[PDB]
Design a protein around this nucleic acid. Structure first.
Ligand SMILES: [Mg+2]
Ligand SMILES: [Mg+2]
Ligand SMILES: [Mg+2]
Ligand SMILES: [Mg+2]
Ligand SMILES: [Mg+2]
Ligand SMILES: [Mg+2]
Ligand SMILES: [Mg+2]
Ligand SMILES: [Mg+2]
Ligand SMILES: [Mg+2]
Ligand SMILES: [Mg+2]
Ligand SMILES: [Mg+2]
Ligand SMILES: [Mg+2]
Ligand SMILES: [Mg+2]
Ligand SMILES: [Mg+2]
Ligand SMILES: [Mg+2]
Ligand SMILES: [Mg+2]
Ligand SMILES: [Mg+2]
Ligand SMILES: [Mg+2]
Ligand SMILES: [Mg+2]
Ligand SMILES: [Zn+2]
Ligand SMILES: [Zn+2]
Lengths: 91, 25, 97, 214, 127, 97, 201
RNA sequence: GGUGAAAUUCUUGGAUUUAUUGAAGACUAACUACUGCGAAAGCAUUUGCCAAGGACGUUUUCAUUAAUCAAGAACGAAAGUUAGGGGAUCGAAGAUGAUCAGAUACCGUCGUAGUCUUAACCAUAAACUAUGCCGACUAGGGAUCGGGUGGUGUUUUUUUAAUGACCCACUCGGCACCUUACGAGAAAUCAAAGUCUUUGGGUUCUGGGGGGAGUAUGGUCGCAAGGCUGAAACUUAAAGGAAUUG
């Protein structure tokens, strides 16, 4: 029984702050609250608290990451750059 | 006048009548 | 009405080719609607060939011509290059001459 | 009131080993003063002369060669392989309509540890008696020919440096081995190496560099 | 026999460059462009101007070290006309007919594997 | 491939899924090949590897998560190790493995 | 009061039997239980600390020292990092591009830590309300809120007073101005809405 | 440097030219064609991976399962929009040098947005073959792309082959051209635009003089720009198509 047409989680701010701020905030809220797959044990138990800190419900691993999301676009394109340059020092 | 410009003419002409009307909304 | 069966030029069963820029006026233009003239001409010319070997090392040397493909825009192809204009009948003939 | 010509130091360029004339040409630098001598300053310049000019024969009229100057002694400065090009006229001739172009390239390491990227080119030929006016390959042919050209070229390198690779290149040893394996696929024609470039040199090694000299 | 330089005649429109350098290229020997030897600004590229500049360049070349030269003729290149200017011919002529040697000359014009959108806009330069 | 072989073992043969029951098989020597999923922790990996050379059991390191090793064996739950008790029709024991 | 997480990292003490705990700034992707390698001869992986001289150009590195051994200076805020754009082995240097866009040359012994700092993207989310900012500076310093010096009286501000709110004289102030004068755009070499890409050359 | 010609502009800051190296983003020249593929948009560097497709071959399988389609839905050039990145090039805007009676332009210069990419919108192009789809029938010809079949064919040498590339004949299924016109059309032309007053194979859609006007209004979709749907009053004897001669 779909409760709201658009606002979603952002319907807590009501009419305040204006639509384009709620749009922007909703996107990053949906990002930060959602449960994420755990690289190490492979159950999707990774949740945030304290921006940049993502830990797992069980197996209790904690990963440092983006403020509102686990892996940030730049972090990845750095992850591959470090792959690359390291292989230069190997082969 | 070029059909394309004649079209842009009334495109504008409509957005303005759109305006004035909403001032009475 | 319709003045050509090839429409502009030479496109059937594609719907999009890709444009090239005209050598003369830079106007973009479809590759198969363009008009291409291979420019193959010796580096030197009529005159300088005799005075070339005369001032040159090596027997007769080599003489390496330069090859570059030309792309014209119609309106630029019309202004100079292969055009003239043809009669209603003479248009059909694709013979190069 | 200057005319640097009335200052300039002069010089003559000497070439490496497996070639015809180790003498090449002349140059100009500056006097070797205290503070900016003529020696370490430039030297390592690069000169490009057709090898038909340095092999003397006209069956080599194309195929420019890049030499790089490493060491200097006493108004005599030698040089080493920096690359190989083609003449623009030859290529621009070679690419004719009505046929299929084929290219390919690979990066590979030699014995003396120069790394290089070599190129290749080929063109589908009509074989005599063929009545169709174009003669194009099957694009599965194109992938195959590239594959063999690849495996062939990765073998000819890693032989003894460019010392042997230049010695391999000069009488086009690769061109026929290509033509050999290829004809089981498609006839082609031309088939040259067309380019090679030097992207990583190992190190000076005055002991090795002097091996082309005497 | 001779002592070899390298020519590199850049002939564009509205000017023509003739300057010989050392066979390694890093070192000059004179220059004298095609604008120098006349002043109308509209005659900058013409053969008569290019001829004179070929004369002044062949002099200084033989006036220092160089009896012989290899030439690389050139056009604007890049995204531009790719077809040589008017005063590259008059230059080669008047520098070989000047009494200097010639050998093994090719075309160094930059030709891309095409890109970097040409100027003048999609509609072209319209006059 | 290796999962196409794995699916054969699954339908024609005997296997045990999970760390506890594949030590049962590794202790009894009832095990022939054991498959270790990519991400399973290195301590468990090293322990399963130590029981393995004690039973002379060959070990195959599956490149993929315990999530997919579970879909490799046709199950809807993740599995970090599989132990092959009886190879089925499949050739896994005598092939590249 | 800090936008990026910290990583408490534990090392043995080489000269005494004991554990010495250090506080790094957690680089993104670093995780609990990971092993961290600090040294000249250390491998290049996210989280390790290496002298700038020991990494190829393009390596991306955080918390990097200005002088060697200053225990880290540059690019510590959540999301930032420096890039190595080159080395000059004689008089050994390494050239880096800082987050500001600047280029700077430091000692090749100056240590970075591989990767980018965690917590990035924090500034993308709108504060949305006074309190969220309130609670922000409450853990930093007492900078908030901010009275416009144009809403004060003259005695209060260079911009103070008037029968309408207006600055009344150019708001660009000289570098050579004096304390109590500098309120405005200080030493501003241009002004107005920046049109066009910025991006140092 | 740039133009018909110039000027703005760049030059002890050695500009333009040269050499060596490096960086960035875009692009894929020539080969490239009356040639390929895709539902259309559209799609040209290499290689690996991922799934997909037509045509053909078929004494394999199922057995009417199909044709076309209001509603509804997938995709949909360029520009444009939201949020990051990127921002080499070219470049709406703007500013300039000229030209002009004027010159808000055409030409030259600077250059914002844009141009590229990710996530999401937008849903439009002369999105053109200005030509619905399925089926049948009606006429010649030489090329060509893909599949196949036939040959004591050619070229490849080795020792004959095997292959591969080629040649010749036939057959499907393509992209087109050529000549015909029985036939059609107002003509231009058209192997369909034919088998139509000798008017009926199946089906979808749109039009009913011009202007008003794709305007008003309502609904609906969109962040917006706008998209789909879409009148009337009034006006008017023409507007229009192809061909002919001037
Ligand atoms: Mg109002
Ligand atoms: Mg007309
Ligand atoms: Mg189209
Ligand atoms: Mg005109
Ligand atoms: Mg306060
Ligand atoms: Mg305030
Ligand atoms: Mg304020
Ligand atoms: Mg007050
Ligand atoms: Mg005061
Ligand atoms: Mg004041
Ligand atoms: Mg005031
Ligand atoms: Mg005010
Ligand atoms: Mg290409
Ligand atoms: Mg519909
Ligand atoms: Mg303007
Ligand atoms: Mg003006
Ligand atoms: Mg005019
Ligand atoms: Mg439409
Ligand atoms: Mg046969
Ligand atoms: Zn976990
Ligand atoms: Zn043109």
């Amino acid at each position: 029984a779909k409760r709201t047409k658009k606002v979603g989680i952002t319907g807590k701010y009501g009419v305040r702050y204006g639509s384009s701020l709620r749009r922007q905030v909703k996107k990053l809220e949906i990002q930060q609250h959602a449960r994420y797959d755990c690289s190490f044990c492979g159950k999707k138990t990774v949740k945030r608290g304290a921006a940049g800190i993502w830990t797992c419900s069980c197996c209790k691993k904690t990963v440092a990451g983006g403020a509102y999301t686990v892996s940030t676009a730049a972090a990845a394109t750095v992850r591959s750059t470090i792959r690359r340059l390291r292989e230069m020092v190997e082969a | 006048m070029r059909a394309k410009w004649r079209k842009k003419r009334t495109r504008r002409l409509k957005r303005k009548r759109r305006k004035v009307r909403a001032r009475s909304k | 009405p319709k003045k050509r069966a090839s429409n502009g030029r030479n496109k059937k069963g594609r719907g999009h080719v890709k444009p090239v820029r005209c050598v003369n006026c830079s106007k973009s233009i479809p590759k198969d609607k363009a008009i291409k003239r291979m420019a193959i001409r010796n580096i030197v010319e009529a005159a300088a060939v005799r005075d070339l070997s005369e001032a040159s090392v090596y027997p007769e040397y080599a003489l390496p011509k330069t090859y570059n493909k030309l792309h014209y825009c119609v309106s630029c192809a019309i202004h100079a290059r292969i055009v003239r204009v043809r009669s209603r009948e003479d248009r059909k003939n694709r013979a190069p001459p | 009131v200057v005319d640097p010509f009335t200052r300039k130091e002069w010089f003559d360029i000497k070439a490496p080993s497996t070639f015809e004339n180790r003498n090449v040409g002349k140059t100009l630098v500056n006097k070797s003063t205290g503070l900016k001598s003529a020696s370490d300053a430039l030297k390592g310049r690069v000169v490009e002369v057709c090898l038909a000019d340095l092999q003397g024969s006209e069956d080599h009229s194309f195929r420019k060669i890049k030499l790089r100057v490493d060491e200097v002694q006493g108004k005599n400065l030698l040089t080493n392989f920096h690359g190989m090009d083609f003449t623009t006229d030859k290529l621009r001739s070679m690419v004719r309509k009505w046929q299929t172009l084929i290219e390919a390239n690979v990066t590979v390491k030699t014995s003396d540890d120069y790394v290089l990227r070599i190129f290749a080119i080929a063109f589908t030929r009509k074989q005599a008696n063929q009545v169709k006016r174009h003669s194009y390959a099957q694009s599965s042919h194109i992938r195959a020919i590239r594959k063999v050209i690849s495996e062939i070229l990765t073998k000819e390198v890693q032989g003894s440096t460019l010392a042997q690779l230049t010695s391999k290149l000069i009488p086009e040893v690769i061109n026929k081995e290509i033509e050999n394996a290829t004809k089981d696929i498609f006839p082609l024609q031309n088939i040259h190496v067309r380019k090679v470039k030097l992207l990583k040199q190992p190190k000076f090694d005055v002991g090795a560099l002097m091996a082309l000299h005497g | 026999s001779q002592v070899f330089g390298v020519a590199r005649i850049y002939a564009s429109f509205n000017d023509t460059f003739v300057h010989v350098t050392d066979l390694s290229g890093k070192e000059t020997i004179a220059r004298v462009t095609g604008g120098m030897k006349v002043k109308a600004d509209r005659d900058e590229s013409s053969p008569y101007a290019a001829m004179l500049a070929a004369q002044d360049v062949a002099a200084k070349c033989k006036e220092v070290g160089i009896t012989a030269v290899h030439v690389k003729i050139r056009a604007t290149g890049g995204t531009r006309t790719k077809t040589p200017g008017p005063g590259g011919q008059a230059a080669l002529r008047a520098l070989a007919r000047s009494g200097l040697r010639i050998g093994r000359i090719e075309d160094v014009t930059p030709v891309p594997s095409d890109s970097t959108r040409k100027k003048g806009g999609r509609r072209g330069r319209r006059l | 491939s290796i999962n196409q072989k794995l699916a054969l073992v699954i339908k024609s043969g005997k296997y045990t899924l999970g760390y506890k029951s594949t030590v049962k098989s590794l202790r009894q020597g009832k095990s022939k090949l054991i498959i270790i999923a990519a991400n399973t922790p290195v301590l468990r990996k090293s322990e399963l590897e130590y029981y393995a050379m004690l039973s002379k059991t060959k070990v195959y390191y599956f490149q993929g998560g315990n999530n997919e090793l579970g879909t490799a064996v046709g199950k809807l739950f993740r599995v970090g190790v599989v132990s092959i008790l009886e190879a089925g029709d499949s050739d896994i024991l005598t092939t590249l493995a | 009061g800090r936008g990026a997480p910290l990583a408490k990292v534990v090392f043995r003490d080489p000269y005494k039997y004991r554990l010495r705990e250090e506080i790094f700034i957690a680089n993104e992707g670093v995780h609990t239980g990971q092993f961290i390698y600090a040294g000249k001869k250390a491998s290049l992986n996210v989280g390790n600390v290496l002298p700038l001289g020991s990494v190829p150009e393009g390596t991306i590195v955080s918390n990097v020292e200005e002088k060697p051994g200053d225990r880290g200076a540059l690019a510590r805020a959540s999301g930032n990092y420096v890039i190595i754009i080159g080395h000059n082995p004689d008089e050994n240097k390494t050239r880096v591009r800082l987050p500001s866009g600047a280029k700077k040359v430091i000692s090749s012994d100056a240590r970075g830590v591989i990767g980018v700092i965690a917590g990035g993207g924090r500034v993308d989310k709108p504060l949305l309300k006074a309190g969220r900012a309130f609670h922000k500076y409450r853990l930093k310093r007492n900078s908030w809120p901010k009275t416009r010096g144009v809403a004060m009286n003259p005695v209060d501000h260079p911009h103070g007073g008037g029968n309408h709110q207006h600055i009344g004289k150019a708001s660009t102030i000289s570098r050579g101005a004096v304390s109590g004068q500098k309120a405005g755009l200080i030493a501003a070499r241009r002004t107005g809405l920046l049109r066009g890409s910025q991006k140092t050359q």
